[PDB]
């Protein structure tokens, strides 16, 4: 009995029990009900990787319960950890590719509209699986049995380089760029709303036609700018039409009628502009929270594993520090495998249409 061993067993059991049925249901809904799109392919691949990773959790529990003693042949001892590493690398690369695609669809929309299809998604998923198998090959090669394991530095170095540094950096950069672009769009919308409001504040008490028409032209320019940021388009068209009517009324020397037409804009403003501004703010808050939670979960799940993998080479196993690292390696791998259960709750279960399909499925 050992507290780290019991903790690892409990974490693995909870991960399995919370991941297997959920991932199974998500995969079933995405395969049998959801239409065949690119995001559907990504979700299917992620759920398949998570299911293949969770199916070996009983084997990990059986191995840990025997206190390392593996009576089976060398075949399983070389196969199952290689399969675990394969699933982990596949999931990491799939998440990185999903982040890259979500960044590219906002960065260059024309290139994605003209090139992004299902064939490219299948090809990049195949390339991801090939790279994962290449990274898994040395695990299956160097593993040997009784205690299943090894008897190494460059392997851990290239693993930290390819599987942890570059994917995490790419994901962080993509999420940061998306957040910055969304915040810039919200700032532009808020500036347009402020230019619409501050000039009406003086139009409501103006006493000259030149300032009125200048402020109305500024309002029209701000509305045309915000239109490129559905009932939204109809409301902006009505707003621009009423602004044009106010301009036509002001050019004829009617200052009071122009002020009345400008004050009439408050109805459609409070009807459409405020509602859509609140909707955009809520959407930005939601996507920012989602990105932050995903990044935090990925870091918490994949940082201690690589930290301990690096420290294993800089610490002698005979020293008490090496024994402590070897004992907590189980907890580290359990926390890393918990990401396989945390994946569907942060990628697939957030879509509104997907949530509705999953609810109607039950």
């Amino acid at each position, epitope marked *: 009995n050992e507290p780290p061993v019991i903790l690892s067993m409990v974490i693995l059991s909870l991960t399995f029990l919370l991941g297997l049925p959920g991932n199974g249901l998500v995969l079933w809904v995405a395969g049998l009900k959801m239409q065949r799109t690119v995001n559907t392919i990504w979700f299917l691949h992620l759920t398949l990787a998570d299911l293949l990773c969770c199916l070996s959790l009983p084997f990990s529990l059986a191995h840990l319960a025997l206190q390392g003693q593996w009576p089976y042949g060398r075949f399983l001892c070389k196969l199952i950890p290689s399969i675990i590493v394969l699933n982990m690398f596949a999931s990491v690369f799939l998440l990185t590719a999903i982040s890259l695609d979500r960044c590219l669809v906002v960065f260059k929309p024309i290139w994605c509209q003209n090139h992004r299809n299902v064939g490219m998604a299948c090809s990049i998923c195949g390339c991801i699986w090939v790279v994962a198998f290449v990274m898994c090959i040395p695990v299956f090669v160097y593993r040997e049995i009784n205690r299943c394991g090894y008897k190494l530095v460059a392997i851990t170095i290239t693993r930290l380089v390819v599987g942890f540094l570059l994917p995490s950096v790419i994901m962080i950069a993509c999420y940061s760029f998306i957040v910055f672009r969304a915040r810039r769009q919200l700032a532009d919308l808020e500036d347009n709303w402020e230019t619409l409001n501050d000039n009406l504040k003086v139009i409501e008490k103006a006493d000259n036609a030149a300032q009125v028409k200048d402020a109305l032209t500024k309002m029209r320019a701000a509305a045309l*700018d915000a239109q490129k940021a559905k009932d939204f388009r109809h409301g902006f068209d009505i707003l621009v039409g009423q602004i044009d009517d106010a301009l036509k009324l002001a050019n004829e020397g009617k200052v009071k009628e122009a002020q009345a037409a400008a004050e009439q804009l408050k109805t459609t403003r409070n009807a459409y502009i405020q509602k859509y501004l609140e909707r955009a703010r809520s959407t930005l808050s939601k996507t920012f929270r989602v990105a932050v939670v995903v990044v935090a979960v990925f870091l918490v799940c994949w940082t201690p594993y690589h930290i301990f993998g690096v420290l294993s080479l800089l610490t002698d196993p005979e020293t008490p520090l090496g024994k402590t690292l070897m004992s907590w390696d189980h907890v580290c791998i359990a926390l890393a495998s918990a990401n396989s259960c945390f994946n569907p709750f942060l990628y697939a279960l957030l879509g509104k249409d997907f949530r509705k399909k999953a609810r109607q499925s039950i």
Partner: antibody, heavy 125, light 110 residues
Framework: SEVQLVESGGGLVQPGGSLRLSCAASGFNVVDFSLHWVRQAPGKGLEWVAYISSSSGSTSYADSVKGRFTISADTSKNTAYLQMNSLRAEDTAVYYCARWGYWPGEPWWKAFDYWGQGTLVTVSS | SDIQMTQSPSSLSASVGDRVTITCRASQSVSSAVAWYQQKPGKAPKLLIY???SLYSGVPSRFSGSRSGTDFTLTISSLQPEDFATYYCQQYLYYSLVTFGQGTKVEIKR
């Protein structure tokens, strides 16, 4: 045929006096597209002159032509008319007629998709 | 007051096949309400690009437009013996806000 705009007010005049430029459209109805005028001096750039709305009645003129020119339209024969008075040496240019659309739709964002033949208005003196 | 427009490339020389860049600046926010026109000596002008983002029908795809804040850029990838003419820019934010640029002329080097 396609959209075509023809002018018939070309010629020479005296300092001041009066002149009437005509703009006939073919291939579309003038009740649904607004007609404007653009000047172009020989060896100079373009300059907006005036705007007439057939289905709205509102008119507009440039800052340098207010109180001197008049613009109108006729939906019977689909013809625009520009009455110019008190002409000077600055008004000697080639007038061009164009059509810009209405905001409820795509033709608004479109540029001057069809230009006229151009009518030369010069002051003899 | 009227929205002023300044066009720095009044005249530039280039060769056949070379790229041409034309920059334009507005007085205040126009919201991409700037179009381009091509006029040959002795003929009526014709449009090539509207809103600095969409290409009009019948116009070759060599011309492209870009917008950055209040600045506009017209790019020609490769010149042809049939497009050497004058280029003008027009603001069409409103009916009573039409304003034209100074014009851009192109010539062939020898």
């Amino acid at each position: 045929s396609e959209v075509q705009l023809v002018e018939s007010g070309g010629g020479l005049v005296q300092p001041g006096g009066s002149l009437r430029l005509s703009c006939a459209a073919s291939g579309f109805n003038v009740v649904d597209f607004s007609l404007h005028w653009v000047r172009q001096a020989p060896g100079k750039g373009l300059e907006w002159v005036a705007y007439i709305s057939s289905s709205s009645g509102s008119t507009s003129y440039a800052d340098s032509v207010k109180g001197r020119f008049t613009i109108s339209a006729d939906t019977s024969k689909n013809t625009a008319y520009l009455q110019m008075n008190s002409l000077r040496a600055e008004d000697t240019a080639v007038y061009y007629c164009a059509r810009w659309g209405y905001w409820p739709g795509e033709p608004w964002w479109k540029a001057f998709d069809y230009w006229g033949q151009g009518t030369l208005v010069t002051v003899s003196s | 007051s009227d929205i002023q427009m300044t066009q720095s490339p009044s005249s530039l020389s280039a060769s056949v096949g070379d790229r041409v860049t034309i920059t334009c600046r507005a007085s205040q926010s126009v919201s991409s309400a700037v179009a381009w026109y091509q006029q040959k000596p002795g003929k009526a002008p014709k449009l090539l690009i509207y809103s600095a983002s969409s290409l009009y029908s019948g116009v070759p795809s060599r011309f492209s437009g870009s917008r950055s804040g209040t600045d506009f850029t017209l790019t020609i990838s490769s010149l042809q013996p049939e497009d050497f003419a004058t280029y003008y820019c027009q603001q069409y934010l409103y009916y009573s806000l039409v304003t034209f640029g100074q014009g851009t002329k192109v010539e062939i080097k020898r």
